[PDB]
Design a protein around this ligand. Structure first.
Ligand code: CYC
Ligand code: PEB
Ligand code: PEB
Ligand code: PEB
Ligand code: PEB
Ligand code: PEB
Ligand code: PEB
Ligand code: PEB
Ligand code: PEB
Ligand code: CYC
Ligand code: CYC
Ligand code: CYC
Lengths: 92, 380, 177, 49, 172, 131, 26, 160, 164, 160
């Protein structure tokens, strides 16, 4: 259902990224970042644009930002575009 | 011939108001004719007197200590001996009119003030100002007032019983005279003590110089700038209060303007007029796709039409729908409603809207670009 | 100008009397059939445009000397002025019927009208006839007895307002005489 | 079958979402879970995903 | 048996005191509706047999056990009593609607109906379901124009439904 | 050569203008935040200083669409007249931050009201002060 | 729900009875 | 079915049914009786509904039965009435299921492809369904007709 | 716009008076009559695409000579602009039912009409024919209520009297 | 355009154009002259083509111009002939481009949605296009008419 159901260390499920997003959240970010591949010179695959601007769901923004930081990318701007701030009920 | 006679001519025997007044700005604001009826309640005499004091003094406070002057000459009107024109003649020759509008004034200011008080109009040209100056200098103030009232223009317009009012004629010979009229009456919250500067220059507000602007506009034919006609004006006291596609009311000028935004706006308007002048020629020639086929389709549509109700069975089944002047040719309720969206849906008209509003935004910025030296700037 | 309410106030002010309960039976009955008064005024102002052209043309087929050369209604300008003071008189009579008092009629319309029509050379015989035809149209429109226009009304009696407007019209006629 | 994803297709054509986000919201749609989630056991669902 | 006007008077004698002006403009408003209320009762008494027969037909197409052999609605007699028991409640709901008060409804319709239906073995819940189906058709039939001036009648159809629910909870 | 309002696109049905005027469908954000834009504007210095030391900076830095009505430094300098001075002089004392906060919060409106949005319209709303 | 048996609804006699002389209804 | 759809939507999230879903299932099983009654009325008046809908369709769309039209001839007209009967049956299924799952899974998924492959104008089928909707709602009460046309409207929207 | 409101506060402004009891008393009738005069407003607003249609062909049925060449309705776009004018006039009557006075009519349809209709050869009798055809087809319990019909007909005949 | 489509199909694979694609571009630029000639002939005989196609359509589908039909009245018939002219122009574009990219990108993508929103029967438009195809192929040679009807057939298939 949601990512914060008690799973941590010593769980049966492997350790992973845990979003705090309420289930079926509809909050969304708008992010701009650069992510060079750093593996294209031994796989020899075609290039792609690495400069991206896109909307990312709130329930996936944390795992996305951590993946971007893992692979040497730089994050240039972040904006919450959809959803309120510090709203108790009503993020779904 | 859409206008038959002017308002300088006497009123015809067929019309209750003048024809020019029915579709000018006359029908909108409070600048209308207030006629004294032939027998009056002491209630409704004061309705006439308040309009007279609003007009002849031209928006003056007039404390009742300054009213015990005029309690003699109002009494001949309250009895019913003085007409309204002889009442304004007696009021102009009183001393409170003199100390307010003659006794600290340059002659240009006094002449242009009694043009606005005793008649509903601005000074027209220079030649009618000079004849009144020479009327005063040889005969005095007393004959100067009778030069205004006792001529042709008063009795054909006001008669003897309408109070004077700011005339929205619709037909202006010298043109600018409309702008001078709108810049002489400065809207509903102005006066002549304020616009003449007779209070700031005065000592404890009394004994003020009744100075005047716009005397360079009377002599040289150099017409009134637009800001005194659009900002403070009877045009917006007598406004139609509707939705204008260019809003004619000026925005107040912004602080902290830069030359960069003016440069980009001046490039925008030059692109827009060039686009307009080429979009003009294509209109009314290649305006429609079903236009060449309009002459072709009419002969196909001519055949098989039945006058009586029920035809076009199209097989052995039903009746069918016809016999309407719009409906005989396939048109619906949406066919006449396409003219009601023709700002947005039209390709030519969009350019004409955005040309005028870029002009209106442009015009206020160089009014704000008249101030240079101790002028701090921003970064937008 | 006065109305029906202020008419009793100037009558009580002539004796410094308070308006008591005797005086208010005439005015609370003025309120009871006030809806009939509004329904009667609305029927007249609806067909006021037909009433002038009805009456003035009736005054013409009375007397062809008005459209005779030299006659008082001979010019288009004079015919327009006659159609103008038909409408002014119908306008002030409908003011007086709405107010319930004839005061606004005979200081704003009829005061000074007789010597005006004498000074202009307006013939008074036809002036009487143009007003009488409008009076006959007024009683037909108030009592809903026009030949070719019937208006929707709640059922009831209306001869009192018809008598009142008939009393205003001969006031007009005796004034212009 | 005439299935359609109007909002998703317009958003991806304009560039508001990337092809990754488009595929992500296709994978959690009702069509996908009706065709490749409901008629299978979870072990088979993993393999197909 | 009281009407809504007699209610406030019966509570005024009890304190022994005159009706104050707030009760009076509460009552002149009630008068000022007036025509709407009788338009409502006119619409229900014009279609009474249709209301009753359609509600009974929906009841037996829904619950077939009452007309099953052995049911409480089995045979011509039991059915004739069931047909117009509903018409009795419709009559007394219309009486209470024209009175503005549910005093005639409690006096001579709902007084002792529950142990009457208990002593006969009649299932009171099915009577209540029949009352609800008459209610739905009556409020559906009440708010149509059908050649009446347009206006709102909402405070009157709420009271009309309240009389039906008062009849429905008292039977069962 | 024809059509003043050209369009974006490529392939058949095009006009010669790239998709989005530069082939950018979804463009990055170039504008700075509220306190950033104010601090570079050069005219809202007192406003930004008061926002920072008052603690209201956290409110306006949130992503929520706000309409800020920041007064220029002229506006704060114009408080030295007698009337407004009598009402706001005690906001200079260092223990009165609680009322400075409400005065500042009254200037922030939830929602984005552009100037063209408000032409010939009268709108009533609640600002962050609750008034 | 309903008034007690026999009592005509709306015209009880114990309406404004004092507490010092009120009688409990059997 | 409402129960089925609630169960799948709860199954994807790997959770039991929340009290809202159980509330709605409860309300559905409580209304099942009038659902069956309405399905009764629509079901056993099928002949008049199909006949009168076919009339209103053929008077509104004379081209489909005109010489050469898709439903031209005795056999083609019979087949079109057969299709209308199909859709009335599906509407009864949907009424008893409490949701358009039966209507949409049978007769709506891929209907445009089928009718394009057959050469039939889909707008004619939409007209026939609308005519049947009016005829069928004429035989119901106010609230019943409102709830029954609720499904005809969905079938029309899917068949644009 | 001339209404019940704008009359009594300009009479007070011309005299320099505060709103007296007559000024408040005049707006009390704007509470009673607005139940009737607003009921015709949505009735005309919802069914305005059948009234313009029924008035436009009645105008040309009274005057068939307008479709002759050289006349006002000779081609199709002129008839299209002719139906647009009846739509404009019914929209102004809808506005006047909402304000409660003859404000929007006198500002937007009446003032200056007698010049443009004479300059562009538009016959005013053909204009009042459509308005009269709308006037006699008012079924007083079927179109609207009784007083809403009175308020509607009183604004139709005002336009009829002003155009002639 | 054939060149454009070859370039994109080679671009997705991240390779230069193979000798087959270059061969085909060469053959296209060599035939461009007769392509322009055929486009000439179809282009400047547009009035007769639209007129005679409109006739064959109105005789084959009298319902669309019957009283009340979609193209009923002078204006609606003119608009339908306007649409036929649109499609003839698109066919000339496709003939000069050597491929149906111009026809399909302009006038075919979303045509069903548009004509359903307008209330127009798409089969009538298909009939009009077929009639125009016969009329236009009557004015060409054998091989030219074969190559020209090649595009009318695609437009008909897309418009089913
Ligand atoms: C929809 C029908 C429901 C139903 C009705 C039912 N009633 C009876 C029997 C009686 N009902 C009454 C009721 C009244 N008598 C009154 O005077 C009044 C006015 C307030 C009422 C409401 C009485 C006295 C009887 C017994 C006399 C008789 O009917 O012969 C019966 C069966 C008859 C019997 O019991 O022998 C039925 C079937 N019962 C249902 O099943 C329906 C829900
Ligand atoms: C002595 C010389 C003299 C003139 C040249 C005219 C010109 C003129 N027109 C208007 C007034 C006007 N003039 C126009 C005219 C036009 N608007 C357009 O879009 C068209 C381009 C153009 C008609 C072809 C309009 C529409 C108004 C009315 C503006 C309004 O009512 O708000 C006014 C202001 C007075 C008024 O409001 O009537 C003047 C002075 N009158 C004169 O006395
Ligand atoms: C406030 C109240 C008020 C009125 C009642 C009218 C009445 C009235 N009419 C005229 C003027 C006139 N009045 C008439 C009218 C008539 N001649 C006839 O033969 C008929 C009997 C009758 C028409 C039915 C004519 C014909 C003239 C014009 C005389 C002329 O032009 O020489 C005049 C003189 C002004 C002018 O020349 O127009 C006045 C005051 N006007 C007002 O302001
Ligand atoms: C010799 C010349 C001559 C005329 C021009 C006419 C004009 C005319 N009509 C009426 C009499 C009337 N005139 C009208 C006026 C009108 N009627 C309507 O239905 C319309 C609303 C409106 C004009 C369009 C009315 C309402 C009556 C009363 C009777 C009736 O028409 O029902 C009268 C007075 C009584 C009478 O004589 O009938 C006259 C003189 N009659 C004439 O004898
Ligand atoms: C703002 C505009 C405005 C009006 C136009 C009037 C409209 C009007 N007239 C009457 C009502 C009436 N009007 C008449 C009048 C007549 N009936 C006849 O058969 C005669 C032909 C005619 C006599 C002149 C009668 C008899 C009644 C009913 C009695 C009454 O209400 O006083 C009523 C009360 C009945 C109702 O409609 O609810 C109203 C509101 N009132 C207004 O507020
Ligand atoms: C024999 C008994 C008897 C009656 C009931 C009345 C019937 C009746 N009702 C109304 C008058 C009315 N009737 C209704 C009622 C309705 N309008 C609706 O749209 C709803 C469908 C329905 C509400 C249930 C309303 C709302 C009015 C008054 C209009 C209003 O108040 O605005 C009138 C007009 C007179 C008036 O307004 O007072 C009459 C004659 N007359 C009688 O003689
Ligand atoms: C001199 C002292 C004195 C009293 C205090 C009262 C005591 C009292 N109260 C009630 C009667 C009542 N008392 C209450 C009391 C309350 N209602 C509520 O909702 C709250 C629980 C509370 C108000 C705060 C109510 C509701 C009734 C009416 C009971 C009923 O009608 O069934 C009765 C029954 C007679 C009657 O109906 O009036 C009596 C004797 N009488 C006295 O003579
Ligand atoms: C907004 C206000 C409003 C109205 C004024 C009417 C207006 C109106 N009713 C009808 C249409 C109709 N109008 C009527 C009404 C009548 N026929 C008569 O002979 C009697 C005089 C009168 C009833 C007393 C009838 C019976 C029809 C249908 C047949 C017909 O045209 O006559 C039409 C023609 C188009 C159509 O069918 O809708 C119009 C514009 N409807 C409204 O919604
Ligand atoms: C806001 C109020 C408002 C109106 C009332 C109309 C009035 C009006 N009509 C026309 C213009 C026209 N109006 C008509 C209408 C008619 N001709 C007839 O014979 C019949 C009487 C009538 C149709 C029933 C025609 C045919 C034209 C075209 C005349 C021309 O172009 O010269 C024009 C000139 C500009 C234009 O083409 O629109 C105007 C201002 N427009 C408005 O904006
Ligand atoms: C590896 C570096 C890194 C960090 C630190 C990080 C933070 C981060 N913190 C988040 C939320 C959050 N962070 C907090 C934290 C706090 N609240 C307080 O009052 C305290 C002051 C503070 C804890 C000390 C809270 C409450 C939220 C939830 C916001 C919300 O649900 O609206 C979110 C939104 C994701 C989600 O929960 O769905 C991210 C991505 N991401 C990263 O990649
Ligand atoms: C199809 C159009 C297109 C282009 C051109 C493109 C370029 C591009 N060049 C890159 C890097 C690079 N590009 C260069 C290029 C140069 N260094 C120099 O000194 C020279 C001046 C220049 C070569 C002439 C270098 C050195 C990097 C590696 C940067 C790094 O590893 O930090 C990267 C980062 C991806 C990666 O290598 O992981 C991209 C995406 N992407 C595109 O989609
Ligand atoms: C370039 C590709 C392209 C096409 C095809 C196109 C069609 C198109 N057809 C239209 C109308 C129309 N089209 C027709 C056509 C027909 N009626 C029939 O019965 C026949 C089956 C058919 C003629 C063969 C009719 C009658 C209208 C007017 C519909 C109405 O206004 O009610 C309209 C609305 C008015 C207008 O023409 O501007 C558009 C935009 N637009 C495009 O950009």
């Amino acid at each position: 259902a949601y990512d914060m159901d008690g799973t941590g260390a010593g769980s049966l499920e492997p350790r992973g990224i845990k979003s705090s997003a309420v289930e079926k959240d509809s909050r969304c970010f708008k992010v701009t970042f650069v992510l060079p591949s750093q593996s294209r010179l031994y796989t020899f695959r075609e290039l792609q644009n690495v400069y991206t601007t896109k909307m990312v769901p709130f329930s996936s923004w944390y795992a996305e930002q951590q993946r971007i930081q893992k692979m040497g990318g730089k994050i240039l701007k972040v904006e919450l575009v959809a959803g309120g701030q510090m709203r108790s009920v009503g993020n779904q | 011939k859409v206008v038959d006679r002017l308002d300088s001519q006497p009123s015809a025997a067929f019309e209750q108001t003048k024809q020019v007044y029915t579709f000018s700005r006359y029908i909108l604001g409070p600048h209308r004719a207030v006629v004294a009826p032939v027998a009056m309640d002491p209630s409704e005499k004061e309705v006439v007197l308040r309009a007279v004091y609003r007009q002849v003094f031209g928006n003056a406070y007039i404390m009742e200590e300054e009213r015990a002057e005029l309690r003699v000459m109002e009494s001949q009107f309250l009895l019913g001996e003085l007409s309204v024109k002889e009442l304004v003649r007696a009021l102009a020759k009183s001393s409170t009119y003199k100390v307010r509008f003659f006794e600290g004034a340059v002659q240009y200011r006094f002449i242009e003030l009694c043009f606005k008080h005793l008649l509903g109009r601005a000074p027209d040209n220079h030649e009618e100002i000079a004849v009144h100056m020479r009327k005063y200098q040889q005969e005095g103030y007393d004959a100067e007032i009778d030069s205004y009232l006792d001529a042709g223009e008063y009795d054909n317009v006001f008669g003897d019983d309408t109070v004077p009012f700011l005339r929205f004629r619709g037909v202006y010979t010298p043109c600018d005279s409309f702008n001078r009229q709108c810049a002489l009456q400065g809207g509903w919250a102005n006066s002549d003590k304020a616009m003449g500067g007779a209070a700031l220059s005065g000592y404890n507000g009394s004994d003020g110089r009744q100075m005047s602007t716009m005397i360079g506009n009377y002599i040289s034919g150099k017409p009134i700038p637009y800001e005194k006609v659009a900002a403070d004006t009877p045009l917006k006291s007598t406004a139609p209060n509707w939705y204008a596609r260019p809003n004619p009311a000026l925005a107040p000028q912004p602080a902290y303007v830069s030359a960069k935004e003016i440069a980009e706006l001046r490039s925008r308007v030059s692109k827009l007029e060039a686009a307009w002048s080429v979009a003009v020629k294509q209109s009314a020639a290649a305006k429609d796709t079903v236009e060449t086929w309009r002459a072709a389709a009419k002969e196909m549509a001519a055949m098989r039409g039945i006058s009586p109700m029920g035809e076009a069975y199209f097989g052995g089944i039903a009746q069918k729908v016809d016999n309407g002047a719009l409906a005989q040719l396939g048109n619906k309720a949406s066919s006449y409603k396409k003219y009601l969206y023709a700002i947005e849906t039209d390709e030519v008209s969009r350019l004409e809207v955005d040309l005028e509003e870029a002009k209106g935004q442009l015009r206020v910025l160089e009014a704000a670009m008249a101030k240079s030296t101790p002028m701090t700037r921003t970064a937008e | 100008m006065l109305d029906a309410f202020s008419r009793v106030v100037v009558n009580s002010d002539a004796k410094a009397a308070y308006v008591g309960g005797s005086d208010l039976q005439a005015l609370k009955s003025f309120i009871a059939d006030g809806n009939k008064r509004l329904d009667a005024v609305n029927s007249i102002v609806s067909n006021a445009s037909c009433m002038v052209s009805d009456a003035v043309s009736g005054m013409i087929c009375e007397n062809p000397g008005l459209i005779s050369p030299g006659g008082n209604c001979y010019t288009n300008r004079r015919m327009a002025a006659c159609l103008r003071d038909g409408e002014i008189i119908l306008r002030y009579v409908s003011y007086a019927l709405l107010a319930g008092d004839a005061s606004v009629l005979e200081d704003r319309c009829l005061n000074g009208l007789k010597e005006t029509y004498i000074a202009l050379g307006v013939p008074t015989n036809s002036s009487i006839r143009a007003v009488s035809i409008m009076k006959a149209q007024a009683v037909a429109f108030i009592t809903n007895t026009a030949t070719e226009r019937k208006m929707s009304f709640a059922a009831g009696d209306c001869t009192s307002l018809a008598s009142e407007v008939a009393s205003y019209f001969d006031r007009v006629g005796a004034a212009i005489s | 079958y005439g299935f359609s994803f109007s909002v998703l297709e317009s958003q991806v054509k304009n560039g508001q979402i990337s092809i990754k986000e488009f595929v992500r919201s296709l994978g959690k749609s009702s069509v996908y879970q009706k065709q490749f989630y409901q008629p299978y056991v979870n072990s088979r669902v993993v393999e197909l995903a | 048996m009281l009407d809504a006007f007699a209610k406030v008077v019966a509570q005024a004698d009890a304190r022994g005191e005159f009706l104050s002006n707030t009760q009076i403009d509460a009552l002149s408003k009630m008068v000022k509706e007036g025509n709407q209320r009788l338009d409502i009762v006119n619409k229900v008494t014009s279609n009474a047999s249709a209301i009753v027969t359609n509600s009974a037909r929906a009841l037996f197409a829904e619950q077939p056990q009452l007309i099953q052999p052995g049911g409480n609605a089995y045979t011509s007699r039991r059915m004739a009593a069931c047909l117009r028991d509903m018409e009795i409640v419709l009559r007394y709901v219309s009486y209470a609607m024209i009175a503005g008060d549910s005093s005639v409804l409690d006096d001579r319709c709902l007084n002792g109906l529950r142990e009457t239906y208990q002593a006969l073995g009649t299932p009171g819940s099915s009577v209540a379901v029949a009352i609800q189906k008459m209610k739905d058709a009556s409020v559906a039939l009440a708010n149509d124009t059908t050649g009446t001036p347009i206006g709102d009648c909402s405070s009157l159809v709420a009271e009309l439904a309240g009389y039906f629910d008062r009849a429905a909870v008292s039977v069962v | 050569a024809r059509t003043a309002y050209p369009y974006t696109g490529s392939g058949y049905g095009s006009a010669g203008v790239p998709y989005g005027q530069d082939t950018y469908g979804y463009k990055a954000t170039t504008a700075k935040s509220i306190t950033e834009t104010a601090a570079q504007a050069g005219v809202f210095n007192t406003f930004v200083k008061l926002l920072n030391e008052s603690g209201v900076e956290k409110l306006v830095e949130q992503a929520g669409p706000y309409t800020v009505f920041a007064p220029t430094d002229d506006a704060f300098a114009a408080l030295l007249e007698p009337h407004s001075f009598n009402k706001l002089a005690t906001l200079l004392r260092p223990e009165n931050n609680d009322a400075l906060r409400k005065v500042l919060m009254h200037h922030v409106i939830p929602g984005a009201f552009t100037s063209a949005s408000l032409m010939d319209r009268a709108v009533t709303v609640k600002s962050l002060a609750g008034e | 729900q309903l008034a007690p048996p026999g009592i005509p609804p709306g015209e009880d006699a114990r309406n404004n009875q004092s507490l010092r002389q009120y009688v409990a209804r059997p | 079915s409402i129960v089925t759809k609630s169960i799948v939507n709860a199954d994807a999230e790997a959770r039991y049914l929340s009290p809202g879903e159980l509330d709605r299932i409860k309300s559905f099983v409580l209304s099942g009786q009038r659902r069956l009654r309405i399905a009764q009325t629509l079901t056993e008046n099928r002949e008049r509904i199909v006949k009168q809908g076919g009339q209103q369709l053929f008077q509104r769309r004379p081209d489909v039965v005109s010489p050469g039209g898709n439903a031209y001839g005795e056999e083609m007209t019979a087949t079109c009435l057969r299709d209308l009967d199909y859709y009335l049956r599906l509407v009864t299924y949907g009424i008893i299921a409490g949701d358009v799952t039966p209507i949409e899974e049978i007769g709506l998924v891929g209907v445009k492809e089928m009718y394009s492959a057959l050469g039939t104008p889909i707008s004619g089928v939409a007209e026939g369904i609308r005519c049947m909707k009016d005829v069928a709602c004429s035989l119901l009460s106010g609230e019943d007709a409102a709830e029954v046309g609720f499904y005809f409207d969905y079938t029309l929207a899917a068949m644009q | 716009m001339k209404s019940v409101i704008t009359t009594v506060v300009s009479a007070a402004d011309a005299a320099g008076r505060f709103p007296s009891n007559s000024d408040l008393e005049s707006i009390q009738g704007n509470i009673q009559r607005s139940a009737a005069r607003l009921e015709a407003a949505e009735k005309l607003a919802g069914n305005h695409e059948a009234v313009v249609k029924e008035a436009g062909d009645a105008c040309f049925a009274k005057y068939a000579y307008l479709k002759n060449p050289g006349e006002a309705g000779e081609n199709q776009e002129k008839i299209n602009k002719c139906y647009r004018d009846v739509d404009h006039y019914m929209r102004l009557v809808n506005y006047c039912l909402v304000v409660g006075g003859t404000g929007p009519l006198d500002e937007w349809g009446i003032a200056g009409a007698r010049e443009v209709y004479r300059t562009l050869n538009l016959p005013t009798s053909a204009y009042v024919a459509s308005i009269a055809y709308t006037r006699d087809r008012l079924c007083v319990p079927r179109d609207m209520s009784a007083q809403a019909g009175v308020e509607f007909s009183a604004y139709l005949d005002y336009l009829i009297n002003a155009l002639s």
